[PDB]
Amino acid sequence: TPTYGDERLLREKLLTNYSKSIRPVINLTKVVDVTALLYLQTLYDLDFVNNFIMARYYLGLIWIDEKLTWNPLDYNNITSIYLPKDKIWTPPIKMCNSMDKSEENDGVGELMLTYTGWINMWSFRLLHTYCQINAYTYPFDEHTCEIYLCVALHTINHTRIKELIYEDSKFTQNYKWDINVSGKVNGTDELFSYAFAPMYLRRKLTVGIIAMLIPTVMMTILTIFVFLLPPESGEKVSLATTIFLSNVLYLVQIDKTTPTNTKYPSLLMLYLMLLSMLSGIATLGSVVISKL
Amino acid sequence: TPTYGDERLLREKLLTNYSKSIRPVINLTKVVDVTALLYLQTLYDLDFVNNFIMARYYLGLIWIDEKLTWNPLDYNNITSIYLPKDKIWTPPIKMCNSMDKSEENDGVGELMLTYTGWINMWSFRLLHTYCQINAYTYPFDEHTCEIYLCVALHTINHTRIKELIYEDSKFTQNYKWDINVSGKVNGTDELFSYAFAPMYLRRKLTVGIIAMLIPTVMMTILTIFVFLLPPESGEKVSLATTIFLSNVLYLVQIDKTTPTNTKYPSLLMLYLMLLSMLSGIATLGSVVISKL
Amino acid sequence: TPTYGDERLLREKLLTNYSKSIRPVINLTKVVDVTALLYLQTLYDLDFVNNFIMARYYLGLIWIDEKLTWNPLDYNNITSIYLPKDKIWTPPIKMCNSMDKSEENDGVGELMLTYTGWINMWSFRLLHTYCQINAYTYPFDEHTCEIYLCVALHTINHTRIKELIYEDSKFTQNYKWDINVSGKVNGTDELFSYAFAPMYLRRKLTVGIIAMLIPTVMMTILTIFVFLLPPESGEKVSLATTIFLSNVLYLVQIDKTTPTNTKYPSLLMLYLMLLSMLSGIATLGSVVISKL
Amino acid sequence: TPTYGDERLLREKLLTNYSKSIRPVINLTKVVDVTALLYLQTLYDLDFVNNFIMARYYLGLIWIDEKLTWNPLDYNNITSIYLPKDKIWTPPIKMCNSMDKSEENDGVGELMLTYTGWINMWSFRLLHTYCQINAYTYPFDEHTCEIYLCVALHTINHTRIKELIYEDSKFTQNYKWDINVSGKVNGTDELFSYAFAPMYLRRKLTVGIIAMLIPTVMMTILTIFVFLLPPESGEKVSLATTIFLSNVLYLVQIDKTTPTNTKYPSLLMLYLMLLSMLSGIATLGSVVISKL
Amino acid sequence: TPTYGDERLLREKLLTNYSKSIRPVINLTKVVDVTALLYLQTLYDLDFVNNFIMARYYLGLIWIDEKLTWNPLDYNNITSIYLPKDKIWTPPIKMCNSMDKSEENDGVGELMLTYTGWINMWSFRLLHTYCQINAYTYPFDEHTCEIYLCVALHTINHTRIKELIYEDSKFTQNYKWDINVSGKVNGTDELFSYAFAPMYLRRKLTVGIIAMLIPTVMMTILTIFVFLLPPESGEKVSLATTIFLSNVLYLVQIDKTTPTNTKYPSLLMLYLMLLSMLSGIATLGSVVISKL
Ligand SMILES: Cc1nc(C(=O)O)cc2c1[nH]c1ccccc12
Ligand SMILES: Cc1nc(C(=O)O)cc2c1[nH]c1ccccc12
Ligand SMILES: Cc1nc(C(=O)O)cc2c1[nH]c1ccccc12
Ligand SMILES: Cc1nc(C(=O)O)cc2c1[nH]c1ccccc12
Ligand SMILES: Cc1nc(C(=O)O)cc2c1[nH]c1ccccc12
Ligand SMILES: *[C@@H]1O[C@H](CO)[C@@H](O)[C@H](O)[C@H]1NC(C)=O
Ligand SMILES: *[C@@H]1O[C@H](CO)[C@@H](O)[C@H](O)[C@H]1NC(C)=O
Ligand SMILES: *[C@@H]1O[C@H](CO)[C@@H](O)[C@H](O)[C@H]1NC(C)=O
Ligand SMILES: *[C@@H]1O[C@H](CO)[C@@H](O)[C@H](O)[C@H]1NC(C)=O
Ligand SMILES: *[C@@H]1O[C@H](CO)[C@@H](O)[C@H](O)[C@H]1NC(C)=O
Ligand SMILES: *[C@@H]1O[C@H](CO)[C@@H](O)[C@H](O)[C@H]1NC(C)=O
Ligand SMILES: *[C@@H]1O[C@H](CO)[C@@H](O)[C@H](O)[C@H]1NC(C)=O
Ligand SMILES: *[C@@H]1O[C@H](CO)[C@@H](O)[C@H](O)[C@H]1NC(C)=O
Ligand SMILES: *[C@@H]1O[C@H](CO)[C@@H](O)[C@H](O)[C@H]1NC(C)=O
Ligand SMILES: *[C@@H]1O[C@H](CO)[C@@H](O)[C@H](O)[C@H]1NC(C)=O
Ligand SMILES: *[C@@H]1O[C@H](CO)[C@@H](O)[C@H](O)[C@H]1NC(C)=O
Ligand SMILES: *[C@@H]1O[C@H](CO)[C@@H](O)[C@H](O)[C@H]1NC(C)=O
Ligand SMILES: *[C@@H]1O[C@H](CO)[C@@H](O)[C@H](O)[C@H]1NC(C)=O
Ligand SMILES: *[C@@H]1O[C@H](CO)[C@@H](O)[C@H](O)[C@H]1NC(C)=O
Ligand SMILES: *[C@@H]1O[C@H](CO)[C@@H](O)[C@H](O)[C@H]1NC(C)=O
Ligand SMILES: *[C@@H]1O[C@H](CO)[C@@H](O)[C@H](O)[C@H]1NC(C)=O
Numbered sequence A, B, C, D, E: 001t002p003t004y005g006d007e008r009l010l011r012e013k014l015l016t017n018y019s020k021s022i023r024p025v026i027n028l029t030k031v032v033d034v035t036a037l038l039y040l041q042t043l044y045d046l047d048f049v050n051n052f053i054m055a056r057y058y059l060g061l062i063w064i065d066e067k068l069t070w071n072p073l074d075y076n077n078i079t080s081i082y083l084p085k086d087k088i089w090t091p092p093i094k095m096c097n098s099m100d101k102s103e104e105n106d107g108v109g110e111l112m113l114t115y116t117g118w119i120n121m122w123s124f125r126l127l128h129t130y131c132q133i134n135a136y137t138y139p140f141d142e143h144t145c146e147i148y149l150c151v152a153l154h155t156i157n158h159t160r161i162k163e164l165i166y167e168d169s170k171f172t173q174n175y176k177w178d179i180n181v182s183g184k185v186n187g188t189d190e191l192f193s194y195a196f197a198p199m200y201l202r203r204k205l206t207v208g209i210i211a212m213l214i215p216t217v218m219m220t221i222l223t224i225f226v227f228l229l230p231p232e233s234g235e236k237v238s239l240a241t242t243i244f245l246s247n248v249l250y251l252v253q254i255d256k257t258t259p260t261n262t263k264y265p266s267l268l269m270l271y272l273m274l275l276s277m278l279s280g281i282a283t284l285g286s287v288v289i290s291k292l
């Protein structure tokens, strides 16, 4: 059976004439094809006001090294070893659309090497990835957020993102957003290789938002009532004034949750503006009637 | 008695042909069984809006090294030494459900080594661990939060979490949540080893929340009074209007503390929506009566 | 074709008598001219209250090394290599107007070296750059923010910023600000070299702000109405009082979004102050009339 | 006089056969007694809602090394040197009740060594130390916060905290809290050595809080007036309603400053709840009278 | 002309028998006099509630090394070189009144060395420096903030701050505070050397705050009017009640901007408390009149 001394001999032979910074190909004319695997773990939140979405992923990079291959029959059948991440060449795959708030660095950890040269490198990344949030159809709204991977500095003649496989790990259920992330896309080769996984997000229809809607609809009933009140009821001015105050309060409060960076404003904005305008016109008519 | 020179000789012999990155077993076919000890120290807070809980723990990892054993009779009876954490192989146990906001790194500190090979490695971890918070039964609510440990990259054929012992250190009393963390669970071996400790949290019934409830219940009395007021009292419209304004203010204010990510909304939400709806219907009836 | 051994020989010869800290010129009387390229990627936000703007850029530095040149015909036609950033002299170009909140350090990464000595060094920088925000013409306001680059410690006799080319990468569209960053400016040589790229920002006229304006203009109609109400209408005091309350609420709420550090306050401030003063004078006149 | 060469010889001889990780005693049966000095510099704030207190301290550790002693007459009377902190054994004294938000690490700096072996090690620590805040007697409230020091991993048979001397440096005056930190406590030896300094904090009676109280007491006068108003005054219902609204606003606003984690709620909570209940009963009586 | 090889020889000779941690004097009885230069660049903000002020400075330290001097005629007239900051002895000047939130460390960068031994070391420091803010005369208020420099661990017999020259770089204009920082102060030698630069700050009288004042003064007019209203006007109670509500709202809102840690509260606090008390007494008198 393989032993500690056997693995020591193997590592000593492997790292003898190895340069960490030279691209690992016998012929430098060859490109290194990297295939990436992005497995969303938990969508923490979807921040509207900052136009960010916070999630945690499991990024796996796979490629092939031609200087790190051996015959297992010469080392008592050792078929894989674990090397420190900072001793070996590693593709410079950067998340160039996200703010990487992970608690580990990209040069600490380990990677698994196989006797054929294939390297597996897995990591945890917590990302704050920028999204252009369209709040038009609030609260029945849908969004599309793209997470980008891109080679840092190497041209497509040196390092390439062969493929990107994105899936959902289903580790936890959300109860707030319907997530749909699943597919397999080839990399795009225009000067520097890159790719992106699209995340589609539909807000789930919990009854809490329906309960929040209830006051609005009854306010619709109340405003129509006061605007179709008799001209000489004897409480039109005060009633319309208080209704206008409450409407202004609602119009102010909705803004603090809704985003200001959208292709279109929300129909709810435009509808509450119409309702406030109707309340104001009702108050003006009441004042005119009292004058007359 | 053992001396400084004796310990120098011991360390020099121990670290002679030692490789930090090779798994510490004479026969590489053997697995290293790690037993973990998680001792909650102080539950700082339970953040509802972010669905996180902040606490401080004392994580202890214990395993056995077969290359670091000696006969104490040959070194004047030295039975244990202290080694820097970054000179020895260390299991890659990651907290893969938590945001590790500790102020130390996982490669600075020390570990105790015994002449039989057993290594003790203890550390402080401040964790922001994700929890799915069910606010259904607020303020008589209970929650269950699971803290996960999982081997980083090694398969169950290489590194395993043998066992997880979780307890409560009772270092401080909370006065806000009844904490119940105590047990002993075997590790789960499905590809990569992992385990989790369940924390059950029940909000304590301090009289401060009762005092907060008082205004609500008396408001129930006041709304029933106004809704069962005589049709021609002469203050129904104004009274009901002001009650509705206060009701809307309460319904808005409760939202800012309660969470939006729940299996069900809180009964308090649904009940205050019913109360506000009754107030609105009372105002409509008052308007109809004034019309008639 | 060039091979791994050829590149090993090349690097070994290049780095033989190289000093990382000596300025890379054969004759020390010569200056090193650095040309910088700043390519704005995405304008995240424009923070009014903190007088900052958050954006992400792509900073590229180009210069020439005279100790790192070779004849490609002697190494099987190798024409470029990749070196670790911390092995070679690198100009100390600091962003001396910004808070660099990037997640990487200025000594980790790679740089491309060409057989003629020309070095390309590209990086991602997330900057919080200070801007003096003039909110005079809100919400039809325009701003100018200058991003500075400056050599750290070397005098213009040693290191110089030859030129600065700034452009907009058009990676995403904003929908909130009209960005206009494009040009080419020589460096300024007054003791220590520096340069700056001007960003002009005009807030876009989305209909959401128009919807926000609607309540204000109708409030203008309502205040003029109440101030030109008949002296003995019988609701002047109460109506004017409520209008004044709403006016004070709006005047308070506008402050929390607008900045306090401006050459002039916003015309909207001065106009809402005039409107509130008119409402107060109307209330005083109503009180005087009721007295009479 | 002593010279640079003399100090070079001294350091070279001292560090020859020195091991950074071996506990610095000739006989390993001996314990190393550490005496700590904690000198509070400025109490920044006392955060009620997070149950933390932020302050800056000056932590000094003193112990004795038996491998770092020399005869000063053999080095031209050199009596003390300065060594880098990371070349020498240093006790692992951790602040195990606090979140260490300092801007330096525990392995960068310097320490003073004396020819007798005595080592002085001084540092700046900014600490966010957890406190259980009893807001019962607000705003005449007193608090007790304990700052803990504890050996990290060594047992009382290896490393001990001999003594802890805590004082107040009086560097600045607070004007918000009366601080009383002064004493001298032996270390506690139960498995692992530790100790704690008690900080007693009494909120100072500035007239600003009295000014804040004034509206409350006059509101007491107003509520008693309305509750002892004649049954048929003709404004009882409206007056009581407005008083109830303002009281509810105060009861809501007080919560946002007061803490939710206390042994008892504040008497101010319970008293304002009594006042709100009395206002509600007054309004109910008014409604009953209007019915009759 | 001097060449790369000449500078290589120079550095090799300079660093031959150099110890980074030995104080750089031939005779150890001599003190090293450090002169510091602090050049404020931009005052970002003056945080009232946290009692901090955020600014960016340019700290320059100058001292003399006696082991790093050469004759330029022996190296082809080389007169200055650039060394890495972490290879040479550096005075441990700490900002011991501030929270150093800079993005660089105190051991990365470069320093210029001259053939006479004089070393220049310049750096960027972003500081959050504690200030005791006296808000007595708000908004015509003045403040004094002292920024401290102090040697870390060396006594005045080893390292001294000879002098401190503080100036204002006038890089940007503020428009919010009148800054006056300029002078030259000797260091204070009481055990450990230190010094401080006083910053005087007077809030500028922009017309925005005048506009903010306008509502207050007109409210003074309105409260005097209602308090000197006829006893039987027929709107005294309701008018005084609404005025009192608005007064309470303003008294609450002013607190959130003003500080709680002051020698005296602001005259604006005391004056608005007087105004609120007068409004309350007016309401009480109105109630008494209605009773009579
Ligand atoms: C489906 C899946 N999920 C996760 C997760 O962290 O959720 C992690 C892995 C994974 N497949 C792997 C294959 C090799 C290494 C790690 C993983
Ligand atoms: C019950 C307990 N509690 C704590 C705590 O920090 O609260 C720490 C330890 C502990 N047992 C240990 C055994 C070995 C090393 C450290 C600890
Ligand atoms: C137009 C442009 N944009 C970006 C971007 O990140 O948006 C990056 C680059 C770029 N040109 C380059 C030339 C060499 C290396 C990198 C880049
Ligand atoms: C009373 C006192 N105060 C402070 C402070 O930073 O406030 C610092 C020290 C000190 N005594 C010392 C003795 C040796 C080294 C440093 C200090
Ligand atoms: C007046 C002034 N201002 C600044 C600033 O960054 O504002 C920087 C410097 C300076 N003088 C120097 C002399 C040597 C090195 C740097 C500086
Ligand atoms: C490298 O190229 C040579 C000739 O071009 C070829 O014979 C050899 O097989 C190549 N090596 C690899 C690993 O492709
Ligand atoms: C080598 O190991 C593989 C996998 O464990 C096994 O299938 C094979 O039979 C082994 N061969 C020898 C010669 O031991
Ligand atoms: C996810 O989105 C894709 C494309 O928008 C669609 O084809 C697929 O059906 C979606 N998933 C589900 C479960 O509907
Ligand atoms: C991706 O590249 C492979 C390589 O030939 C090609 O067969 C395939 O059609 C491409 N597209 C997709 C979607 O896989
Ligand atoms: C390793 O394996 C050999 C044979 O398989 C056995 O004799 C030996 O005892 C094993 N060593 C250990 C430490 O289990
Ligand atoms: C070795 O040490 C242990 C524990 O201190 C003790 O029980 C034993 O008697 C010692 N043996 C010798 C030979 O000193
Ligand atoms: C803690 O929870 C477990 C399982 O939910 C239960 O068996 C145990 O009784 C609980 N602890 C206490 C003190 O009740
Ligand atoms: C855990 O594993 C041990 C190992 O045999 C087994 O005896 C035990 O039943 C398992 N379960 C628990 C709860 O300990
Ligand atoms: C350096 O200077 C010498 C004489 O001044 C000149 O001959 C030589 O070409 C110069 N080298 C470079 C690289 O400019
Ligand atoms: C060297 O490489 C360049 C670019 O690949 C090519 O144009 C040239 O013909 C090559 N020369 C030789 C001798 O291989
Ligand atoms: C950008 O600004 C410059 C100078 O202010 C101006 O010349 C140019 O026309 C602007 N860009 C566009 C697209 O108008
Ligand atoms: C910049 O410097 C070059 C160098 O000669 C000069 O030709 C040019 O006029 C300068 N100005 C601009 C705007 O390029
Ligand atoms: C160490 O122990 C021996 C005998 O036990 C004793 O003679 C010697 O003085 C001790 N050394 C110290 C430094 O205490
Ligand atoms: C050694 O130094 C001390 C303190 O400076 C002094 O008191 C003593 O006289 C000196 N002795 C000699 C021999 O220089
Ligand atoms: C500080 O507290 C201790 C114990 O609580 C007390 O003895 C001492 O008198 C207090 N300090 C002052 C100045 O009163
Ligand atoms: C602390 O320990 C010393 C050591 O003997 C002892 O004399 C003293 O009584 C103890 N208690 C205090 C408060 O110092």
Ligand SMILES: *[C@@H]1O[C@H](CO)[C@@H](O)[C@H](O)[C@H]1NC(C)=O
Binding pocket: D001, E026, E027, E066
């Ligand atoms: C050091 O001291 C000696 C005698 O005390 C003196 O001759 C020499 O000049 C001094 N060196 C320096 C650099 O002051």
Ligand SMILES: *[C@@H]1O[C@H](CO)[C@@H](O)[C@H](O)[C@H]1NC(C)=O
Binding pocket: E077
């Ligand atoms: C040395 O350089 C200085 C400054 O460049 C110059 O004034 C002096 O003439 C030069 N001397 C020689 C001998 O080159």
Ligand SMILES: *[C@@H]1O[C@H](CO)[C@@H](O)[C@H](O)[C@H]1NC(C)=O
Binding pocket: E180, E181, E200
């Ligand atoms: C700055 O303050 C000092 C002392 O307070 C004063 O002498 C000086 O005149 C002030 N500066 C100006 C420009 O008035």
Ligand SMILES: *[C@@H]1O[C@H](CO)[C@@H](O)[C@H](O)[C@H]1NC(C)=O
Binding pocket: E184, E185, E186
């Ligand atoms: C500072 O020290 C020098 C040194 O002699 C002295 O001349 C001067 O008077 C001192 N005071 C000031 C303000 O410079």
